[PDB]
Amino acid sequence: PIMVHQAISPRTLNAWVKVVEEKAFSPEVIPMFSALSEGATPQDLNTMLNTVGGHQAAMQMLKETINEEAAEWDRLHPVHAGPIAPGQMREPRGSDIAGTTSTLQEQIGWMTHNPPIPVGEIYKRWIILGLNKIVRMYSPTSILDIRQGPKEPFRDYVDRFYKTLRAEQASQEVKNWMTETLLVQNANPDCKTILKALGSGATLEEMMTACQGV
Amino acid sequence: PIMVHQAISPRTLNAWVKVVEEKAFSPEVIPMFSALSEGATPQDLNTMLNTVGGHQAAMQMLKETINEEAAEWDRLHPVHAGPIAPGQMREPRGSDIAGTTSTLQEQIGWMTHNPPIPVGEIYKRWIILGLNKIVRMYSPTSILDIRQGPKEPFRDYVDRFYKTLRAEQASQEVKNWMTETLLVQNANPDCKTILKALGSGATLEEMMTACQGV
Amino acid sequence: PIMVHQAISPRTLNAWVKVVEEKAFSPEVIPMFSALSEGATPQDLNTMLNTVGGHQAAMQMLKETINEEAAEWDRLHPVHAGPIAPGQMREPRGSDIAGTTSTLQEQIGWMTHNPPIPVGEIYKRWIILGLNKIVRMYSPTSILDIRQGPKEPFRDYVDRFYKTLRAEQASQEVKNWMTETLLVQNANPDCKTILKALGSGATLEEMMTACQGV
Amino acid sequence: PIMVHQAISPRTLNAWVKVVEEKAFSPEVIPMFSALSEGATPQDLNTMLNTVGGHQAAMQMLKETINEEAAEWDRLHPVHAGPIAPGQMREPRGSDIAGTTSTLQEQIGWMTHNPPIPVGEIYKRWIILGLNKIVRMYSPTSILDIRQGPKEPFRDYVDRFYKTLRAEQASQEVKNWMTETLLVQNANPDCKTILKALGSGATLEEMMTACQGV
Amino acid sequence: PIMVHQAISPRTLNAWVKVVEEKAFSPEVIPMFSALSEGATPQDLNTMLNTVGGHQAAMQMLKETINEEAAEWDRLHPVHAGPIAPGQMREPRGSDIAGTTSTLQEQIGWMTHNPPIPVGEIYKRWIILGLNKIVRMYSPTSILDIRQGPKEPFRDYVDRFYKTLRAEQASQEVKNWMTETLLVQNANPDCKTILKALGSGATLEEMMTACQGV
Amino acid sequence: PIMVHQAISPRTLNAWVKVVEEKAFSPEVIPMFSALSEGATPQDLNTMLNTVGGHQAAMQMLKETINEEAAEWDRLHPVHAGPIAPGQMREPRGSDIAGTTSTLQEQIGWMTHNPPIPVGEIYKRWIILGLNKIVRMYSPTSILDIRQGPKEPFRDYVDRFYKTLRAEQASQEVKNWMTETLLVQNANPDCKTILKALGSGATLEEMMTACQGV
Ligand SMILES: [Cl-]
Ligand SMILES: [Cl-]
Ligand SMILES: [Cl-]
Ligand SMILES: [Cl-]
Ligand SMILES: [Cl-]
Ligand SMILES: [Cl-]
Ligand SMILES: [Cl-]
Ligand SMILES: [Cl-]
Ligand SMILES: [Cl-]
Ligand SMILES: [Cl-]
Ligand SMILES: [Cl-]
Ligand SMILES: [Cl-]
């Protein structure tokens, strides 16, 4: 990554490869990806994606999302005809942001220049957008089906609930509705009664400590 | 972390991930977290939290604590209306300290500027506050129940006592009362007699060496 | 690699060696190679190749490809007779780009000089060209033979399809034809009907989510 | 640690944690601790101690020793009343040296300032003092009980002798008396005769090579 | 290694040690050695050799080769009598290049001085010369004995051929003769016929793809 | 180690610890030690020795050798009475070189000052001197007892010979006599005849290749 240019480290690459083998597309893979690609050029971002073996339905799916975002960027940013003056550099296309039609030096130029054109962070947003689509498709369970089993420790039910909740790509408002509606509704009879008694404004801490004995 | 900005290292991230898998929320997890997040920006702190898979009841609980602290910061620090002058940067909100509504560059700006606004260390205190709440809730044993078993080496009883003591979030004054009261009271008959004979001002060293033979 | 010269790191070398032992010549080996050889001089590129034990039919094959590209470079770039002036350095031959007839200092000279002569990136392209030839020869399955089995989850069929597709060295236009023709054609009866109903312009996401239940 | 400030490295922390799990409080733990804490601030020293899980009787014992040394420092160094001038910084208390009542910046200030106030090395001496107390208490064998068994290779007896000797916290004069008295006295009959014949001034090398055959 | 002097890294040393234990004197050991000794002083080169345990017939053999090359250097470079002036440094002998009679500082002096006297790269060539002698002696199979077995995949026969070829220290002209003569001659009947039909100028790629079905 | 001071790295320390556990006092331990202690101050050298657990007969033996060398240094270098002037630093005693009576800063002073007083390299020579004494004492086999067994491959006999030779601390002249006398003398009948026929000036290479078939 990068403001002095640097190659992607052996142990960044290796760490990313192992993450995908072990955890596939579990929600936490996406923060790991972003963490390992901090300050990454499009070339470095493409490296991480291309070094993934297997999971090629998702990697192909990711390409289409990236292409869709590229087409959208080109629509909003039409390229103007003309010779690039000595002090300036050309406007990036969608394919330049995705790294397929731009050199490393062009990518370095845009990121470092005074008006920064952060193609690294733009392309990364496109990748993360497509990764979210994969997680949601690749999640086995639906949030609607998470119901506490009889004699299930609440703590284990809440772990399953917010884990499954974590893989829906839901906005904060949508995730807020699911919490106040499904969590208490789908608790088991013994603890559900207790939770109705806490009222309409109790924290998760209060709900978990309330059903700790039961 | 950071005064030159730096990305979170592959082996910092990986170390933190393994800590939580192996040790869950054992008291020592919190010092490990703080150690691995030294000089961290809110973006780096959020990275560590988001890269944790599982334990999503606690991670959700942690969000509420962070939001409570954010609401408290906003109450004490009301934002004033106006255009941010060239030489200055805006006042951070609670959400800016938690990183959700601020950019990396804004976080870098506050931490490096001459009046330092250490959003990293402020947000970290909020996270550590919530981590303490988790440890205490997630501790299986109570300090009141730690009693030395018949024929139990004192050393093993003291290990269990101060381990269980370690997970209560007790102030120094509260932890002091538990030591002078419960430790000797809940020792086994043979060693308890010996300890009453040491008097009301003996060190742990003297108590452990006194009951070494018995 | 390199603009200050640096030796190839112990853990770059070791990482590359393990990659080839574990994954042989699977498509992802090539992006891994390029990633680990970022900014590499021809000497560093030769190091990575020579440190590979076994697979000597491929490594020998790679030599011929490199020699073919060297012969082509010499044809296009004929060397002129004359003593190299103090301020300049000689024109590289194909063997100079491949590192066999040039010193490390000559390779450093070309890469750093004001008109950059990127022998590292030129030789790397020749190596990657030959690596593609190996992958295609060393691929066991043909893309034509990938047919979805009865009761096979589409997701698994698409994984096999784009994995096998990945090892053909096909241009984008050739890979595009295979997608729109073979993927739907070679699906199993139950899902194939569903896919004909999506129409002639649906994304992979829509095709995978359509055949998710079936 | 530090004269430019630096955070404690991931692999320093991890190394220290593993040392205590594997070797507990074996004499060599103390040199390992000092080695891993070279140039450490009190904050870094507290980190290493707090990240130790288990062994909480010793860690609590260590706190008391540190508090005793703190009380002693305060007695010898009484704090004077007054506002700290711009060019100077306040006098450290015992709690400031132990890091509990001082900030990282105050600790950095004292260590770097022209009259250096090495709170890191002072606090480290207090910690090492308490670690020695633990080793001696936690040693199972006494030096008095190490007697060479019949047919025991001297080399193995000398290994046991100086290992057990190593955990007594004995001054050089006390350890010198034990060598010249117990080592030869407690050897087995066959080798003991040989050693009396070497005389009152022979080296360990001469004693070991003398009893090599026997 | 080195133009600022540096000590050999822990992980360079360890990597080299493991290479020799696992792979002995397989052809690839020599490129690994050269890679790990890039920019090495004679002291660093001697370190790598001396840290090898076992294989002492080869390490002794290597000493003689180094001594032979040293004697040859002294013959070609006779030392002149005189006091070394302040601005200059003495001429290196063979033993100075091998590090046995020169200090680290003398080795640093020669490598860094304006007329560079690369004792590191000279001594390294002597070591690599002797390593080649070992590989050839320590190779179990002869290139003459590599014959394709009945029903042996050509690819496996070519792997064995160029592996065994790799350990002969043969010049390019000698290795060229073996390829065009033995490879086709010693193929099995079914594939041999096919290869005669390709003609006297076909690549390894064409030969391997020709005998792929057979 | 060091001309800017640096703390001993976590992975230097750990590497040294593992070396001694796995290989004890095999000849190669000594080059490993020297390699890992390149540029080490006496404090760093003492760290490596003190972090060794077990083997305390040898570590104690090493202390005596170091003390003997210290006494010898003091005899040759008598300390003169007087106050150390501002521009100068005091003369080191034997105990100052061994680090027991000197501070880290004094050790840094001597090593960096214009007339360098390399206490690191002096003390290291004393340690290496004592390590050689240990290896020789701790070697199980004598060079005199290495005789080639009937049907033993010469290569294996030469490995045993120069391995056992390696642990005698023999000068080059003493090791030279053992080679020309014992190696051929103690070979087995079949190969011994062959070696007498090579003559009185053949290399190890010629001797090993001569007895390769037999
Ligand atoms: Cl993310
Ligand atoms: Cl969520
Ligand atoms: Cl903490
Ligand atoms: Cl506590
Ligand atoms: Cl590639
Ligand atoms: Cl593809
Ligand atoms: Cl110590
Ligand atoms: Cl001792
Ligand atoms: Cl080589
Ligand atoms: Cl070859
Ligand atoms: Cl040595
Ligand atoms: Cl030897």
Contact flag for C and F (3+ C-beta pairs < 8 Å): no
CB proximity list for A1: less than 8 A, separation 6 or greater: A8, A37, A38, A39, A40, A41, A44, A120, B7
Q: Which two tokens stand for residue E173?
A: 């002209």
Backbone dihedral angles phi then psi of residue C41, each to the nearest 5 degrees: -80, 165
Q: Rounded to whole angstroms, how far apart are CA atoms A208 and A194?
A: 11
User: Distance between alpha carbon A121 and the CA centroid of its chain, in Å?
Assistant: 13
Give the residue among B120, B109, B112, B110 at the shortest CA–CA distance from B47. B120
Give the residue among F142, F154, F150, F42 at the shortest CA–CA distance from F98. F42
Ligand positioned closest to the Cα atom of B34 = 3
Ligand positioned closest to the Cα atom of B37 = 3
Q: Whats the size of chain A, residue-wise? A: 214
Closest CA of chain C from E163, distance in Å: 6
Gap from CA of B51 to ligand 4 centroid (Å): 29
Q: Which two tokens stand for residue B23?
A: 């040790």
E93 by Cβ neighbours in 10 Å (0-12 / 13-18 / 19+) ranks as middle
Give the residue among C115, B57, D140, B99 at the shortest CA–CA distance from A179. B57
* Buried residues in B133-146 as b, exposed as e (16+ CB within 10 A): bbbebbbeeebeeb
Closest CA of chain C from A162, distance in Å: 24
Written as one string, the DSSP assignment of chain C is ------PPPHHHHHHHHHHHHHHTT-TTHHHHHHHHTTT--HHHHHHHHHT--S-HHHHHHHHHHHHHHHHHHHHHSPPPPSPPPTT--PPP-HHHHTTSSS-HHHHHHHHHSSS---HHHHHHHHHHHHHHHHHHHH--S-GGG--PPTT--HHHHHHHHHHHHHTS---HHHHHHHIIIIIHHTS-HHHHHHHHHH-TT--HHHHHHHTS--
Backbone dihedral angles phi then psi of residue C153, each to the nearest 5 degrees: -60, 130
Closest CA of chain F from E111, distance in Å: 19
What's the Rg (C-alpha) of chain B? 23
Q: Indicate the DSSP class of residue D213.
A: -
User: Distance between alpha carbon F64 and the CA centroid of its chain, in Å?
Assistant: 16
Q: Which chains touch E (3 or more CB pairs under 8 A)?
A: C, F
Residue type, A134: I
Question: Rounded to whole angstroms, what are the CA distances from B138 to A116, B132, B164, E142?
Answer: 47, 10, 12, 68
Contact flag for E and F (3+ C-beta pairs < 8 Å): yes
Q: Rounded to whole angstroms, how far apart are CA atoms D81 and B123?
A: 34
Q: What angle do CA B120, B121, B122 make, to 5 degrees?
A: 95
Contacts 24+ apart (CB under 8 A), D20-27: D20/D52, D20/D55, D21/D54, D23/F53, D24/D55, D24/D138, D25/D55, D25/D58, D25/D131, D25/D134, D25/D135, D25/D138, D26/D135, D26/D167, D26/F53, D27/D135, D27/D163, D27/D166, D27/D167, D27/F53
Q: Rounded to whole angstroms, how far apart are CA atoms C178 and B110?
A: 54
Q: Rounded to whole angstroms, how far apart are CA atoms D171 and D179?
A: 12
Give the residue among F201, C85, D7, C176 at the shortest CA–CA distance from B35. D7
Give the residue among C166, C136, C118, C37 at the shortest CA–CA distance from A43. C37
Q: Rounded to whole angstroms, how far apart are CA atoms B34 and B40?
A: 9
Residue labelled with tokens 């288990």: D54
Residue labelled with tokens 């670690």: D131
Looking at beta carbons, which residues of chain F come within 8 Å of D10?
none
Q: Rounded to whole angstroms, how far apart are CA atoms F86 and E154?
A: 80
Nearest CA in chain B to D138: B155
Interface B-D, measured as beta-carbon pairs within 8 A, has a size of 62
Say if CB B188 and CB B150 are below 8 A apart. yes
Residue B210, SS3 per DSSP? helix
What's the Rg (C-alpha) of chain D? 23
Interface of C to A at Cβ within 8 Å reads: 1, 9, 11-12, 15, 23, 26-28, 31-32, 34-36, 38-39, 155, 158-159, 161-163, 165-166, 203-205, 208-209
Give the residue among B92, B101, B33, B39 at the shortest CA–CA distance from B62. B33
Q: Rounded to whole angstroms, how far apart are CA atoms A208 and F188?
A: 81
Annotated binding site of D for ATP: 11
Helices B29-36, D10-23: inter-axial angle, 10-degree rounding:
150
| Beta-carbon separation of A7 and C38 below 8 A | yes
Gap from CA of A168 to ligand 11 centroid (Å): 62
Q: Indicate the DSSP class of residue D179.
A: I
Nearest CA in chain B to A13: B10
Dihedral, A84, A86, A92, A93 alpha carbons, nearest 10? 20
| Beta-carbon separation of F7 and D39 below 8 A | yes
Closest CA of chain C from E158, distance in Å: 5
Gap from CA of C53 to ligand 2 centroid (Å): 48
Among candidates A32, A36, A162 on the partner chain, residue whose Cβ is nearest the Cβ of B57: A162
Q: Rounded to whole angstroms, how far apart are CA atoms B71 and B94?
A: 7
C99 by Cβ neighbours in 10 Å (0-12 / 13-18 / 19+) ranks as buried
Task: Tell me the H-state helices in A41-118.
Answer: 42-50, 56-76, 94-97, 104-112
Nearest CA in chain D to F5: D3
Interface of E to C at Cβ within 8 Å reads: 1, 9, 11-12, 15, 23, 26-28, 31-32, 34-36, 38-39, 155, 158-159, 161-163, 165-166, 203-205, 208-209
Contact flag for F and D (3+ C-beta pairs < 8 Å): yes
List the end-to-end C-alpha distance of chain E, in Å, as a whole number.
52
Q: Rounded to whole angstroms, how far apart are CA atoms F10 and F204?
A: 42
Helices D119-138, D29-36: inter-axial angle, 10-degree rounding:
160
Dihedral, B165, B171, B173, B175 alpha carbons, nearest 10? 0
Gap from CA of E137 to ligand 2 centroid (Å): 65
Question: Rounded to whole angstroms, what are the CA distances from B21 to A167, B14, B54, B101, D167?
Answer: 20, 11, 9, 29, 36
Residue type, D51: T
User: Which of D12, D21, D36, D56 to probe by mutation at the B interface, max B CB count within 10 Å?
Assistant: D56
Written as one string, the DSSP assignment of C139-183 is --S-GGG--PPTT--HHHHHHHHHHHHHTS---HHHHHHHIIIII
Q: Which two tokens stand for residue D76?
A: 């010898």
Q: Rounded to whole angstroms, how far apart are CA atoms E59 and E23?
A: 15
Q: Rounded to whole angstroms, how far apart are CA atoms C191 and C178?
A: 18
Say if CB F168 and CB F161 are below 8 A apart. no
Q: F75 labelled as ligand-binding?
A: no
Q: Rounded to whole angstroms, how far apart are CA atoms B41 and B197?
A: 54
Residue labelled with tokens 């390709």: E198
Q: Which chains touch C (3 or more CB pairs under 8 A)?
A: A, E
Sign of CA dihedral E30, E34, E40, E41: positive
Interface A-C, measured as beta-carbon pairs within 8 A, has a size of 62
Say if CB E92 and CB E117 are below 8 A apart. yes
Most distant pair of Cα atoms in chain B: their distance: 75
Give the residue among F180, C136, B19, F179 at the shortest CA–CA distance from D17. B19
Q: Which two tokens stand for residue A102?
A: 């731009």
Contacts 24+ apart (CB under 8 A), A49-55: A49/A127, A50/C28, A50/C31, A51/A13, A51/A16, A51/A17, A51/C28, A51/C31, A51/C32, A51/C35, A52/A17, A52/A20, A52/C28, A53/C23, A53/C26, A53/C27, A53/C28, A54/A21, A54/C159, A54/C163, A55/A20, A55/A24, A55/A25, A55/C159
Sequence-ordered strand ranges (E) for chain E: none
Dihedral, C53, C54, C55, C61 alpha carbons, nearest 10? 70
Residue labelled with tokens 């971002």: A45
Q: Rounded to whole angstroms, how far apart are CA atoms B23 and E11?
A: 29
Most distant pair of Cα atoms in chain C: their distance: 75
Ligand positioned closest to the Cα atom of E29 = 9
Residue A72, SS3 per DSSP? helix
